[PDB]
Amino acid sequence: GPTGTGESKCPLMVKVLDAVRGSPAINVAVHVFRKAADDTWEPFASGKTSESGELHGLTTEEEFVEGIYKVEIDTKSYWKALGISPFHEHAEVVFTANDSGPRRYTIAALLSPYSYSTTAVVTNPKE
Amino acid sequence: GPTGTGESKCPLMVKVLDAVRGSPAINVAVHVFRKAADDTWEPFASGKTSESGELHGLTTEEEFVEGIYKVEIDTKSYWKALGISPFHEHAEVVFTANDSGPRRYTIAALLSPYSYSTTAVVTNPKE
Amino acid sequence: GPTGTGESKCPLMVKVLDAVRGSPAINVAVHVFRKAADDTWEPFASGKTSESGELHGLTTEEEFVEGIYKVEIDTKSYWKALGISPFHEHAEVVFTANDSGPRRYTIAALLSPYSYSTTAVVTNPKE
Amino acid sequence: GPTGTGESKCPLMVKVLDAVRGSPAINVAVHVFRKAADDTWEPFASGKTSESGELHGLTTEEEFVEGIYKVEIDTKSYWKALGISPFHEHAEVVFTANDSGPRRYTIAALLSPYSYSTTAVVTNPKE
């Protein structure tokens, strides 16, 4: 695996899949932002998906406080490397982190050239 | 509302999209079956999607009685003709229809070589 | 093909579906932005989906010049009004448009409380 | 975890997610069929998803020969337990297993009351 800014009990994980080739989406850049008080997006963590299409160790429990986050997936670069013309500039996921709910957040993204789907799996357990 | 093999107030429509090309999926074969009294699948209607990736005129309100129906979409032929060998043999949609009176059903499918999604839009008639 | 805030040969359309109720998503707020010369998002058009879950009349072929556009769909308001508290704050679609002449763009979105999918259908004009 | 008929290097795994609640789909029945020479479907393996929404140990490498398989997911029961009216009778995935391609097959299914998506991840490595 690759990583981000601080690694611990992995409160946040990203998984990206390729719907064209039926495989993990490898070496895809992912940037995480936290919404700041001035309503701007502050860089928070970043990395590249591993050979199993996952990105772990982006943050730690102490750091992952309640707030608004944005996960940006560089889908355009991914398709370009394959010699395929994509529609989207990138894929963005914006969500609120709340302490009330379950503690691990898994963001999954399924990519096609002209379409994507994203889903959140929120649990108590592990990934 | 007519009666037979045509289109009533089109009680059943199919719409198919291609997530690789960002266009309607044209000339896709569709076969519809109804579960008979003896529990086997009987042929009900068939057609091919048009240039807009839609299929209308499959049945009439009179012919479309209460029952369990299967919509089979020939995805494999579609991809092979494009030079791609896909994962699935076909996409199948199975549902109970009209069990509380006549409804209008739109079955939508979004295709990728290794993934598909299907959604139903159900409307309670009148004109 | 007109000119301004209306609908040319409707160059940009949005369609939103609800995967929980099996119906169009009605009264969903949509905001469109264009990336300005200084790299910031400028307001371009806004509307609400109709009873068929579509939004037409956002722009004209003349106003819809080459550029990077963001379509923001207010999913959170939609679900909350239904008594559900959803995962995402909104769904965002970002793309380059018209970089090889005028095209017609349909942006479709399928909504679930913890997941959404978006697809683009691009057509090369004429009438 | 739960299991199927013979457990080994897990050539076939099933993962099911709930798009309404953003969680694993637990205790969902899954039946696997292999297409027989008479063109009928022979029961092959079955089980219920575990608390992480997965089903492993359905088969072994020796048994998983090339052929046509069907994976049936009992989605209707799942929604009914939640007190939600679903559209589909069940979700079906039909595919050919070939020795040429990568060796592990992961079938994932994302469920909503009126929609589902399925994706195949085929790899050399592990799950």
Side-chain angles (χ1 to χ4, degrees):
Chain A
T3 188
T5 181
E7 162 205 89
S8 147
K9 289 183 174 298
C10 254
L12 179 70
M13 199 253 298
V14 177
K15 191 175 187 92
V16 190
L17 301 186
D18 177 337
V20 178
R21 310 195 274 168
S23 64
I26 296 167
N27 293 156
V28 178
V30 177
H31 291 267
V32 187
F33 304 93
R34 183 182 189 262
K35 196 150 211 197
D38 58 5
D39 255 286
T40 69
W41 296 107
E42 199 188 356
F44 183 76
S46 67
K48 283 225 168 226
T49 64
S50 82
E51 292 271 327
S52 78
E54 305 179 341
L55 210 207
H56 322 78
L58 286 170
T59 193
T60 64
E61 254 172 23
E62 286 325 19
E63 256 179 275
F64 199 52
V65 299
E66 292 185 301
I68 302 168
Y69 297 81
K70 182 176 64 186
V71 173
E72 186 153 275
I73 304 160
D74 174 19
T75 65
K76 201 189 178 149
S77 287
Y78 179 80
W79 294 116
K80 276 173 57 190
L82 258 26
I84 293 171
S85 228
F87 176 79
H88 304 90
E89 283 297 306
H90 54 251
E92 279 189 1
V93 177
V94 183
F95 68 92
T96 298
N98 262 92
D99 281 348
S100 322
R103 310 183 221 314
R104 198 285 198 288
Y105 296 79
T106 304
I107 304 307
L110 174 67
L111 312 178
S112 306
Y114 280 67
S115 182
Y116 67 83
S117 146
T118 190
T119 315
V121 189
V122 181
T123 69
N124 277 30
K126 302 165 66 284
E127 67 214 19
Chain B
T3 317
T5 209
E7 43 223 334
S8 202
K9 296 87 59 186
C10 237
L12 178 65
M13 199 268 284
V14 181
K15 186 183 192 44
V16 188
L17 299 188
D18 175 334
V20 177
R21 307 193 334 142
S23 66
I26 301 165
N27 248 268
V28 177
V30 177
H31 297 254
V32 186
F33 305 87
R34 183 192 185 263
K35 222 166 196 169
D38 67 358
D39 246 66
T40 66
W41 294 109
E42 296 175 82
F44 182 80
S46 67
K48 274 179 184 184
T49 65
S50 70
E51 291 294 334
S52 69
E54 310 179 340
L55 179 54
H56 317 102
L58 289 171
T59 198
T60 63
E61 174 175 340
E62 303 334 349
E63 188 174 332
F64 201 39
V65 293
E66 186 173 354
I68 298 170
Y69 290 80
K70 170 172 24 149
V71 173
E72 163 178 297
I73 306 169
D74 183 22
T75 63
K76 195 179 198 179
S77 293
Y78 179 78
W79 292 118
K80 283 175 74 100
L82 267 60
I84 298 176
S85 84
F87 184 68
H88 306 91
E89 290 298 300
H90 51 60
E92 334 55 51
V93 171
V94 181
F95 62 106
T96 309
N98 303 310
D99 63 324
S100 314
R103 295 295 183 267
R104 306 189 176 144
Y105 295 91
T106 297
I107 311 286
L110 173 65
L111 311 184
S112 297
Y114 277 72
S115 177
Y116 66 79
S117 114
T118 188
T119 191
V121 177
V122 180
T123 281
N124 157 62
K126 169 180 168 296
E127 338 83 337
Chain C
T3 317
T5 209
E7 43 223 334
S8 202
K9 296 87 59 186
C10 237
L12 178 65
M13 199 268 284
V14 181
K15 186 183 192 44
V16 188
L17 299 188
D18 175 334
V20 177
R21 307 193 334 142
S23 66
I26 301 165
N27 248 268
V28 177
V30 177
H31 297 254
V32 186
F33 305 87
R34 183 192 185 263
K35 222 166 196 169
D38 67 358
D39 246 66
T40 66
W41 294 109
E42 296 175 82
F44 182 80
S46 67
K48 274 179 184 184
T49 65
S50 70
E51 291 294 334
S52 69
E54 310 179 340
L55 179 54
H56 317 102
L58 289 171
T59 198
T60 63
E61 174 175 340
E62 303 334 349
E63 188 174 332
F64 201 39
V65 293
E66 186 173 354
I68 298 170
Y69 290 80
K70 170 172 24 149
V71 173
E72 163 178 297
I73 306 169
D74 183 22
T75 63
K76 195 179 198 179
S77 293
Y78 179 78
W79 292 118
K80 283 175 74 100
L82 267 60
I84 298 176
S85 84
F87 184 68
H88 306 91
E89 290 298 300
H90 51 60
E92 334 55 51
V93 171
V94 181
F95 62 106
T96 309
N98 303 310
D99 63 324
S100 314
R103 295 295 183 267
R104 306 189 176 144
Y105 295 91
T106 297
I107 311 286
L110 173 65
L111 311 184
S112 297
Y114 277 72
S115 177
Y116 66 79
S117 114
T118 188
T119 191
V121 177
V122 180
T123 281
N124 157 62
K126 169 180 168 296
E127 338 83 337
Chain D
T3 188
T5 181
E7 162 205 89
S8 147
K9 289 183 174 298
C10 254
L12 179 70
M13 199 253 298
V14 177
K15 191 175 187 92
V16 190
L17 301 186
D18 177 337
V20 178
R21 310 195 274 168
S23 64
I26 296 167
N27 293 156
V28 178
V30 177
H31 291 267
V32 187
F33 304 93
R34 183 182 189 262
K35 196 150 211 197
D38 58 5
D39 255 286
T40 69
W41 296 107
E42 199 188 356
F44 183 76
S46 67
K48 283 225 168 226
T49 64
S50 82
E51 292 271 327
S52 78
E54 305 179 341
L55 210 207
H56 322 78
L58 286 170
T59 193
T60 64
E61 254 172 23
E62 286 325 19
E63 256 179 275
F64 199 52
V65 299
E66 292 185 301
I68 302 168
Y69 297 81
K70 182 176 64 186
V71 173
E72 186 153 275
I73 304 160
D74 174 19
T75 65
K76 201 189 178 149
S77 287
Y78 179 80
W79 294 116
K80 276 173 57 190
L82 258 26
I84 293 171
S85 228
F87 176 79
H88 304 90
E89 283 297 306
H90 54 251
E92 279 189 1
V93 177
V94 183
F95 68 92
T96 298
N98 262 92
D99 281 348
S100 322
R103 310 183 221 314
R104 198 285 198 288
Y105 296 79
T106 304
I107 304 307
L110 174 67
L111 312 178
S112 306
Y114 280 67
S115 182
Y116 67 83
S117 146
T118 190
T119 315
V121 189
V122 181
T123 69
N124 277 30
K126 302 165 66 284
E127 67 214 19

